[PDB]
């Protein structure tokens, strides 16, 4: 059973998003922006956390929201003691939501309380207007920006202790940014993936079994992939299916340790677990948290055991991977 408040909240998204996707693959963008629930940044702490909006790349208008316990502070000296910086990529299937979306503002606030660190939430460019690889470009831009701020740095070796994190499409983005980091010898302390979004041309058992049962449909999954991938591409494109027929194994790369959180009632759970399996197979460290009773979005409402469990696993993983 889905708790009633989760059911109501996620259904509200499901039904609204139904009217925004057009049959021709275009999107009701102005209406989507108008209907999204969002909050401003606020320098004044709410429950001990403050937030600040900042453009980090003027060429593409790329903005982030920075959260910390409580503008000029970015200049501040590297902290004596280590702290995590979590670079967060919101969900919404490459198409929806924003760093200002209340569900994500609230999650980032909770991440700061939980990590005693800093959260940088990236307003990546969205599909269908901006297709592959724009969102990945923006996450790489954000990683490099974070690494270069004195404030973000900490510990003996005064460096940014960066974790890449995201749910849904943002978890996909986190992965691809992490791969690029490993290719370029940029150190990432860990990836935190919540229901990371992956796909492929064939359906898995979970996809066929859970289709339409828990807010998500294959029609809509196919729609979002079509919206993000190049016009001539299919779901076996490596952005979508990083270890499928057109994929690339990651053996030998200095790849991040991964905490991989999977909802058992997310119809794509099979792919997330096979993703984890492939990382392990490539010699990388993976911790998988399977939340068998959880639907998509469970980490958004503090109303299930899985919610509490996962916040604790996140805290443990951060602590374990900081020093
Ligand atoms: C069309 C969509 C997009 C969904 C799934 C389906 C219905 C509910 C949506 C959200 C809406 C709330 C969260 O952003 C989200 C991450 C979540 O938990 O549910 C979204 C999810 C996704 O982008 O993967």
Q: Per the structure block, which two tokens stand in for 103?
A: 């569900």
The CB density around residue 157, as the number of other CB atoms within 10 Å, is 10
Give binding residues for gibberellin A3 as ranges.
92-93, 104, 168, 220, 297
Neighbouring-strand partners of residue 67: 51, 119
How far is residue 80 from each of residues 35, 71, 149, measured CA to CA in Å? 43, 21, 15
Cα separation of 153 and 79, whole Å?
6
Q: Per the structure block, which two tokens stand in for 19?
A: 């009217």
User: CB-based contacts of 312: which residues, under 8 Å, 6+ apart?
Assistant: none
Cα separation of 204 and 81, whole Å?
46
Contact 10, 295 (CB under 8 A): yes
Cα separation of 20 and 210, whole Å?
23
Pairing of strands 84-89, 159-167: parallel
Number of domains in the chain: 1
Neighbouring-strand partners of residue 148: none
How far is residue 107 from each of residues 69, 90, 194, measured CA to CA in Å? 14, 10, 12
The CB density around residue 110, as the number of other CB atoms within 10 Å, is 20
Cα separation of 169 and 54, whole Å?
22
Give binding residues as ranges.
92-93, 104, 168, 220, 297
CA 192 to chain centre: 8
Pairing of strands 62-69, 49-57: antiparallel
Contact 187, 160 (CB under 8 A): no
Which numbered atom of ligand 1 lies nearest the CA of 297?
18
Cα separation of 101 and 90, whole Å?
9
How far is residue 73 from each of residues 52, 119, 152, 154, measured CA to CA in Å? 11, 14, 10, 14
DSSP classification of residue 136: H
Please confirm, yes or no, whether 115 is among the known catalytic residues. no
CA 248 to chain centre: 21
Contact 109, 103 (CB under 8 A): no
The DSSP-derived string for 62-126 is EEEEEEEE--GGGGS--BSS--EEEEEE--STTTS--TTBHHHHHHHHHHHHHHTSEEEEE----
Single out the catalytic residue among 98, 168, 169, 263: 168
Give resolution, Å, one decimal.
Answer: 1.9
Please confirm, yes or no, whether 266 is among the known catalytic residues. yes
**Residue 317 belongs to what H/E stretch?**
helix 305-322
Region of residue 152 (phi > 0: left; psi between -120 and 50: alpha; otherwise: beta) = alpha
Q: Per the structure block, which two tokens stand in for 107?
A: 């999650």
Ligand 1, from 297, 304, 310: best to mutate by most atoms within 8 Å of Cβ?
A: 297
Distance from Cα 297 to the centre of ligand 1, integer Å? 7
Cα separation of 156 and 8, whole Å?
48
CATH number, residue 262? 3.40.50.1820
Q: Per the structure block, which two tokens stand in for 94?
A: 């490459």
Ligand 1, from 12, 91, 165: best to mutate by most atoms within 8 Å of Cβ?
A: 91
Cα separation of 161 and 142, whole Å?
14
How far is residue 104 from each of residues 16, 66, 90, measured CA to CA in Å? 18, 12, 7
The whole domain housing 270 covers 1-323
Distance from Cα 294 to the centre of ligand 1, integer Å? 13
Q: Which residues line ligand 1 (CB under 6 A)?
A: 10, 13-14, 17, 91-93, 96-97, 103, 167-168, 215-216, 220, 296-297
């Amino acid at each position: 059973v889905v708790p009633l408040h989760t059911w109501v909240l996620i259904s509200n998204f499901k039904l609204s998003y139904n009217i925004l996707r057009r049959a021709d693959g275009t999107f009701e963008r102005d209406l989507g922006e108008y209907l999204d629930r969002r909050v401003p940044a606020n320098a004044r702490p709410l429950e001990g956390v403050s937030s600040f909006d900042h453009i980090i790349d003027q060429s593409v208008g790329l903005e982030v929201r920075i959260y910390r316990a409580a503008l000029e502070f970015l200049t501040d000296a590297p902290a004596a003691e280590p702290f995590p910086v979590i670079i967060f990529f919101h969900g919404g299937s490459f198409v929806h939501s924003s760093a200002s979306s209340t569900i994500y503002d609230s999650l980032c606030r909770r991440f700061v309380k939980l990590s005693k660190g800093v959260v940088v939430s990236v307003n990546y460019r969205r599909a269908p207007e901006h297709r592959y690889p724009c969102a990945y470009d923006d996450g790489w831009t954000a990683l490099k920006w974070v690494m270069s701020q004195p404030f973000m740095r900490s510990g003996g070796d005064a460096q940014a202790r960066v974790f890449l994190s995201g749910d849904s499409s943002g978890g996909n983005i986190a992965h691809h940014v992490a791969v690029r980091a490993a290719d370029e010898g940029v150190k990432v302390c860990g990836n935190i993936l919540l229901n990371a979004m992956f796909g492929g041309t064939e359906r898995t058992e979970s996809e066929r079994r859970l289709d339409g049962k828990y807010f998500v449909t294959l029609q809509d999954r196919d729609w979002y992939w079509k919206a993000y991938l190049p016009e001539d591409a299919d779901r076996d494109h490596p952005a979508c299916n990083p270890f499928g027929p057109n994929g690339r194994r990651l053996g030998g790369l200095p790849f991040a340790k991964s905490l991989i959180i999977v909802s058992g009632l997310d119809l794509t759970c099979d792919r997330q677990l096979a993703y984890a399996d492939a990382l392990r197979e490539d010699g990388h460290h993976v911790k998988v948290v399977q939340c068998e009773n959880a639907t998509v979005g469970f980490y958004l409402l503090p109303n299930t055991v899985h919610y509490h469990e996962v916040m604790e696993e996140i805290s443990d993983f951060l602590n374990a991977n900081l020093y």
